[PDB]
């Protein structure tokens, strides 16, 4: 009855603690305000529960602590609608009720709670030991901190410290600005000759006995390099391995002019200087070039060339070993064509 | 013809630098140099 | 009468510079490497005694370390600037704690 | 007084053993990879540089676990002029790798390997290593 | 405000987790084992003593590879007076181990484990470890 | 005839190199040392070769180089006995001979060869490539350095640097002589009470809340301990886990009186102080004891006991946790009875 | 004293090399002049000294090599 | 191939014994004089060689600077053979027996190459 309902807000503020943001309902039926006016309010049927929901949704949906001890709560089929109204709740007490199943806890298991009390409920006899009970509650709430006034020990937690951060991918490395100027000038000159079409001028950059070889990935659009790809993991014949290698500057530069004419984006070269000693200098070059002849004259290639250089007089460097890896360009490699 | 002069003179000179041999043999070596010059 | 302390086979080899340093101390191009640390440095050189040709320094493995060379693009090579540059190089190497062996030919002429 | 085709066949007969050692050892025994580099060895890994046995062991402790499947290998004997009286071979490797919790990526890598002579046993050690992703910038 | 039967059952439900982590991790990921010891951890291995995170990593690099088969385990929660306000458990493990190129031996070992508290997450770390062979003298 | 040998010594001395201890028998038929004497020397017949071997066997078995090139050497079935006569021989030349099969090579694989010449012999044609031939030569001599005047590169050798040495097994660790005297002293007191027969005197060494537990290995002589052997690997029941644990000083020393009376060898105790803090001291003790009551008073046991002790007023230490591992002693543990 | 004996022995070894050239009948004119002059002077020298040419013409072979081994 | 340190005129000279001492140390008869005090002694000898090691012996003799014969070594007709190690034994015998009497002893340059 609504006249009876009217007094409920009074009795709720009567048991509302503003100092601790706690609501006390320990044994609400035997509070002689229910005996007055001849109105009793039972906490099992939904009418009273929904009235309280309306009250709280209008007054204080940010409460942190709540005490519902000893209130004959048989089932919580009707309290599942508390999660959306007061999600700030941290402390909950459900002691001394008639909660038949711990599965009833699955009916409000969407909260983020800090403290719970479940003693007095008969359900505690349904577990062999205390660990089965605590783990069955962990199945519904791991957010809790203290249960039955007992501070729960933090669970098993072994951080192996397995590292998964990959270092920063930096760009061109030369070391000294002097080696930078050196290898960059060499790249510019060499690849200027290389894109002219008459590559015969490379003979003054290569050694009499400068080796050279070509490689590509395994599967065409890149057919013209296929016939000279050298991959020793896949190729077993040793004498064929020897004849598939190019040895003298004559044979090297001839084979190099046999390759389709190119245009390299040298302004977009990426150079890695691996080792520098007094007697040799190895460095790898990652870049792009476009072909201009054949059927695939619009197809664009990406390359990773490796150079080993013995010193040459007047700050020059003579290639002794040369390995050209050629692939087709990535999508964004195509996008970042030339600057 | 001229060579045995060259080799024998080398041999005598490196006997002399070891400080071996008579003074007349060093004098005759000096004469050998003066003759080989011409 | 002239000197020969180094084989022309090892005298013709070129080299790279890890820490390149160049100085003009008169009609002189003086070139040094600073990167060599705590390694024996042997001083061998061929010269006449008046004019200059070339100065080189080796390690135990056979790597060239220091050089001095005159220029025709600069005036005539008088000996005393070179003599000062020699000490300059040995000092620049004792900076890097390189133990430095000096052959006995050099002190006879500079 | 030295044959050349033999230099090439030793280079090939060497590269597959070195690959089968180095990548299986990085995948399986990471703690142990660092001793394959000689003391004065240098490494450029995606632009970042490592110098020294000690910091190499450090870098490999810090690297995530790996799962390499190698695509292609090429090798070249290196002329006696780069390293006098040193048997030296260059290897280039294209492959893929899946790191610990990181997307699998394609890569190019190249080593230079010298054999140093010890009266107990002559042994092989890396002097340079260069590794880079094919999509390293992205 | 603290139960005891729960303390013991947590020690038990924890010790087997730690065992299944530590010995599997020594067999598989040796590079990472040292990080289980807190910075002030101590270890006595057959009379030789290890103190310090860094020297722990060094020593674990120095140990050979391993093959553990564990025989028996026991655990005890340690009274709040030994480590105040620290949840701590003692674990003892008797088992067998086969080393790399070394003869297989039986052993006893005991760890002490404390949980460190962080407002983000508490984690478990070793504070003491004692390892010895049953035939250690031979 | 032996005088044939006498004259053979002359030309052997003419062809002996004293700077390199080398003997040349290259093409003995040409260059008229044989023609200036009208004697042919066939190196296929066993008598002639054995005589030639004997000359050096008397004169200079420390030869360094030997040349047997171009001497119609079909088979060496009788020269395999050369290794023992001149073992310092390091260089051997068999070029241009008639060595038909590699089957001969297994008969002389005891030499210490550094340089070998086997070109010109037809057997070298029996391999498709050079790697099979060179590995077949490694099959007989890996000591070699140069073959046929060609400098062979040292073979493939990757030392994984796999460590397998176990560190030196030292004995008792205390660190400070103060902790040494202390923990030895405490072990002595506790194990003196322990062998008195009335172990109840342990109540003042244990804590009010000191836990205790027992363990033994899995396979008997250790039957009486089964009732209290505790292995969480074998035992899953949690309430049984609690009941097999000994909790209070009372229950602990009661359970400790349940075990058969003992006598420990403390002069042979092995002490490991794991951690010393300001608030605790953990240490394990390894030792032996003999029982003196019951049926197994002739059976000897070995143990690894672990103690954790908090400091106590008046320099004492209170046991808080006690774990006893008990096994039967090994044979060598029995032998090293008392010191 | 020993210098005299050693120098005479080396002189006679040089002359013995010369007479071996004469054993191959290469009549070297200036060298044959040196040969016959050495003969006429050294026979008299050896007659005054008391050591025969047959000693020196074979002792010099090692006196010469003592210097060559020292490089 | 053979050596000549002694002229056949000097190869044939016989000599007297001051303090006669003869010993057979191997296949060699060694003859010495002990009365000689502090006088220079030169060892000259003719023999044959094989692999830079003495094959056989013809004669070993010791002179002064004045030319007096001191010691002799002769092979035996009762024992013809003599390997170089026996010769080395005779060599050491001579060095000792002569430095006893403090007689300075010169060694010609042929002999020391082989012992």
UniProtKB/Swiss-Prot annotation, chains A, F:
Superkingdom of origin: Eukaryota
Subcellular localization(s) per the UniProt record: Nucleus; Nucleus, Nucleoplasm; Nucleus speckle; Nucleus, Nuclear pore complex
Main location (coarse class): nucleus
Tissue expression profile of the protein: Expressed ubiquitously.
A molecular function GO annotation: RNA binding
Disulphide-bonded residues: none
Protein purpose: Involved in the nuclear export of mRNA species bearing retroviral constitutive transport elements (CTE) and in the export of mRNA from the nucleus to the cytoplasm (TAP/NFX1 pathway). The NXF1-NXT1 heterodimer is involved in the export of HSP70 mRNA in conjunction with ALYREF/THOC4 and THOC5 components of the TREX complex. ALYREF/THOC4-bound mRNA is thought to be transferred to the NXF1-NXT1 heterodimer for export.
Designated name of the protein: Nuclear RNA export factor 1
Native species: Homo sapiens
This protein's encoding gene: NXF1
UniProtKB/Swiss-Prot annotation, chains D, E:
Keywords per UniProt: Acetylation, Cytoplasm, Nucleus, Protein transport, Transport
Keyword Nucleus attached: yes
GO biological process, any: protein export from nucleus
PROSITE patterns registered for this protein in UniProt: NTF2_DOMAIN (PS50177)
Effect upon mutating residue 112 to R: 70% reduction in mRNA export activity
First-listed, main subcellular location of the protein, grouped into a coarse class: nucleus
Matches recorded under InterPro entries: NTF2, NTF2-like_dom_sf, NTF2_dom, Nuclear_transport_factor_2_euk
Listed SUPFAM superfamilies: NTF2-like
Domain NTF2 intervals: 14-133
Keyword Ribosomal protein (UniProt): no
CC terms in the record's Gene Ontology section: cytoplasm; cytosol; nuclear pore; nuclear pore central transport channel; nuclear RNA export factor complex; nuclear speck; nucleoplasm; nucleus
GO molecular function per UniProt: small GTPase binding
Annotated compartments: Nucleus; Nucleus speckle; Cytoplasm
Subunit organization: Heterodimer with NXF1. Forms a complex with RANGAP1, RANBP2/NUP358 and NXF1. Interacts (via NTF2 domain) with NXF1. Stabilizes the NTF2 domain of NXF1 by heterodimerization. The formation of NXF1-NXT1 heterodimers is required for the NXF1-mediated nuclear mRNA export. Preferentially binds Ran-GTP. Associates with NXF2, NXF3 and NXF5. Does not bind nucleoporins (NPC) directly, its association to NPC is mediated by NXF1.
Described purpose of this protein according to its UniProt entry: Stimulator of protein export for NES-containing proteins. Also plays a role in the nuclear export of U1 snRNA, tRNA, and mRNA. The NXF1-NXT1 heterodimer is involved in the export of HSP70 mRNA in conjunction with ALYREF/THOC4 and THOC5.
Protein name: NTF2-related export protein 1
Species per Swiss-Prot/TrEMBL record: Homo sapiens (Human)
């Amino acid at each position: 009855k609504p006249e009876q309902v009217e007094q409920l807000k009074l009795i709720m503020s009567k048991r509302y603690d503003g100092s601790q943001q706690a609501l006390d309902l320990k044994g609400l039926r035997s509070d002689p305000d229910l005996v007055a006016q001849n109105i009793d309010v039972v906490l099992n049927r939904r009418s009273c529960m929904a009235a309280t929901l309306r009250i709280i949704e209008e007054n204080i949906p940010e409460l942190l602590s709540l005490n519902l001890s000893n209130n004959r709560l048989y089932r919580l089929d009707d309290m599942s609608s508390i999660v959306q109204k007061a999600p700030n709740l941290k402390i909950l007490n459900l002691s001394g009720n008639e909660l038949k199943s711990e599965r009833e806890l699955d009916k409000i298991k969407g909260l983020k709670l800090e403290e719970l009390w479940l003693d007095g409920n008969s359900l505690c006899d349904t577990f062999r030991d205390q660990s089965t009970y605590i783990s069955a509650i962990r199945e519904r709430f791991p957010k809790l901190l203290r249960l039955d006034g007992h501070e729960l020990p933090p669970p098993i937690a072994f951080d192996v410290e397995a590292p998964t951060t990959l270092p920063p991918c930096k760009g061109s490395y030369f070391g000294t600005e002097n080696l930078k100027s050196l290898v960059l000038h060499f790249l510019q000159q060499y690849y200027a000759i290389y894109d002219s079409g008459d590559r015969q001028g490379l003979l003054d950059a290569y050694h009499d006995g400068a080796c050279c070889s070509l490689s590509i990935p395994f599967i065409s659009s890149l057919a013209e390099y296929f016939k000279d790809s050298r991959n020793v993991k896949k190729l077993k014949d040793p004498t064929l391995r020897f004849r598939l290698l190019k040895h003298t500057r004559l044979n090297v530069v001839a084979f190099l002019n046999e390759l389709p004419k190119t245009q390299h984006d040298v302004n977009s070269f990426v150079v890695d200087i691996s080792a520098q000693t007094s007697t040799l200098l190895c460095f790898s070059v990652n870049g792009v070039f476009k072909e201009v002849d054949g059927k695939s004259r619009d197809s664009l290639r990406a390359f990773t060339r490796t150079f080993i250089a013995v010193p040459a007089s007047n700050s020059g460097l003579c290639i002794v070993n040369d390995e050209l890896f050629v692939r087709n360009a990535s999508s964004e490699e195509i996008q970042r064509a030339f600057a | 013809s001229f060579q045995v002069d060259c080799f024998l003179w080398h041999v005598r000179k490196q006997v002399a630098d070891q400080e071996l041999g008579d003074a007349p043999f060093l004098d005759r070596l000096r004469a050998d140099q003066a003759s080989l010059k011409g | 009468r002239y000197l020969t302390d180094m084989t022309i086979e090892e005298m013709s080899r070129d080299w790279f510079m890890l820490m390149p340093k160049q100085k003009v101390a008169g009609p002189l191009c003086v070139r040094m490497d600073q990167a060599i640390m705590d390694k024996n440095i042997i001083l061998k050189a061929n010269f006449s005694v008046e004019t200059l040709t070339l100065l080189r320094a080796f390690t135990e493995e056979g790597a060239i370390v220091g050089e001095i060379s005159p220029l025709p693009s600069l005036p005539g090579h008088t000996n005393e600037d070179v003599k000062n540059a020699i000490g300059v190089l040995i000092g620049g190497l004792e900076w890097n704690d390189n133990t430095v062996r000096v052959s006995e030919t050099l002190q006879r002429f500079a | 007084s030295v044959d050349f085709k033999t230099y090439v066949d030793q280079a090939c007969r060497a590269a597959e053993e070195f690959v089968n050692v180095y990548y299986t050892t990085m995948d399986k025994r990471r703690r142990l990879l660092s001793r394959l580099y000689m003391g004065t060895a240098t490494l450029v890994w995606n632009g970042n540089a490592v110098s020294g046995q000690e910091s190499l062991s450090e870098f490999f402790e810090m690297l995530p676990s790996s799962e390499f499947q190698i695509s292609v290998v090429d090798c070249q004997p290196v002329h006696d002029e780069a390293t006098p009286s040193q048997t030296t071979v260059l290897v280039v490797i294209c492959g893929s790798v899946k790191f610990e919790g990181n997307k699998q990526r394609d890569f190019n890598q190249n080593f230079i390997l010298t054999a140093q002579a010890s009266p107990s046993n002559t042994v092989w050690k890396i002097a340079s290593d260069c590794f880079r992703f094919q999509d390293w910038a992205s």
